[PDB]
Each structure stands twice: as C-alpha cells, then as structure tokens.
Amino acid sequence: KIEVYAQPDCPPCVIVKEFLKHNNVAYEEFDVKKDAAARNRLLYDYDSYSTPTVVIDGEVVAGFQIEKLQQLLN
Amino acid sequence: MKKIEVYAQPDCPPCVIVKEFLKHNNVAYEEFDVKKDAAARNRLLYDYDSYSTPTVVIDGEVVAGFQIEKLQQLLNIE
C-alpha cells in the first residue's frame, strides 16, 4: 500500500526511509537501479523521474519532500 | 552561541533526520549531545526554553522539535 522507490547513492532516500521507520510505517521498497520493472513503474505509473518517490495509497510524493509524508500518512 | 547549533541525543531518529537533512544541504552547523554534555543540556532547557531534541538554533532563533519546513525557511537554503 505504501511503496518507496529508491536508488544507490541517494542520501534523501535514506532520510525518507528513516522518517517512515520512526513512524512505524508498513512500506515496501524497490531499487530503480537494480530493478528495471520498478524503474518502469516509476516513470510510467507514477510519472516520476527521480528518487526517492513514495506512493501512498496511489498518491505520488516525488523527490525529497519530508513534510508531505507527514501530510498523507498521518 | 554558534551561528547554527543542533541539539541532539542518542536514540533520537528525528535528530538523525534533521542532521542528515542539514548535511544533504551542506549546512555549516555545530552539534551537541545533551545526554553527554551537561552544559549543552542546560542551554537547551534554560536558555532556549526547549524540552526535547532535536532543537536547532539559527542566528538566535530557536526551532524546537521536528520542523523541517521552518528550518528550510530560516536557513535560506531552499
């Protein structure tokens, strides 16, 4: 239900994950570097060019925006 | 006071998030551990009127707790 799209050497990705963990959010994570299917979903399903991208109930939070995770997750 | 002060402690994920945010933005801050540094703890509580970490002081202005957008604004970094 919550999906995190991340890639190597991505400091904002690590930060977003720590925020989700601290909030005990139940997410699944994908690597758009290793995983071409995840990459295609990032571009074609979510119309996003960058990581981190977080999808919450199909709402797309693209790039490094810690305050919106707070908005949409509670 | 240093221009940018970060008050933190161990086992404080919001503190880690704030410090990493500041690092990613290449902010020139000084940090203090209020568990290990009793003087820093006293400044947090008695000078800055804040009861928890993270607390960031930016040119004298106290930002208590996890306030990323307010940090961004005060640091003139966005």
Author numbering:
A (entry chain A): 3 to 76
B (entry chain B): 1 to 78
What does the paper say about this structure?
Thioredoxin (Trx) and glutaredoxin (Grx) are small ubiquitous proteins acting as cysteine disulfide oxidoreductases in the cell and belong to the thioredoxin superfamily. The BC3987 protein has a C-P-P-C active site motif that differs from what is typically observed for Trxs and Grxs.
Substituting the conserved Thr8 that is close to the active site with Ala has altered the hydrogen bond network and the effect of this has been characterized. The BC3987 wild type and T8A mutant structures were refined to 1.4 and 1.18 Å, respectively. In the T8A mutant structure, all residues 1–78 are visible in the electron density map of the corresponding high quality chain. In the other chain, residues 3–76 are observed, with lacking density at the side chain atoms of Asn76. The crystal structure of the T8A mutant resembles the wild type structure and the C-P-P-C motifs in these structures superimpose with a RMSD value of 0.053. One possible explanation for this observation is that both cysteines in the reduced C-P-P-C active site have lowered pKa values. The pH-titration curves for wild type and T8A BC3987 in Figure 1 are similar in the pH interval 6.5–9, indicating that the nucleophilic Cys12 pKa value is not affected by the T8A mutation. Following the reasoning above, the wild type BC3987 has two titratable thiolates with pKa values 5.1 and 7.2 while the T8A mutant has one thiolate with a pKa value of 7.2 and a second thiolate that behave different from the wild type. The efficiency of thioredoxin insulin reduction is measured in this assay, and from the curves in Figure 2 it can be concluded that the wild type BC3987 has a different reactivity towards the substrate compared to the T8A mutant. The lag-time before any precipitated insulin is observed is much longer for the T8A mutant, and the slope of the curve after the lag-period is slightly steeper for the wild type enzyme. Disturbing the hydrogen bonding networks by removing a highly conserved Thr residue near the buried Cys resulted in decreased efficiency for the BC3987 thioredoxin.
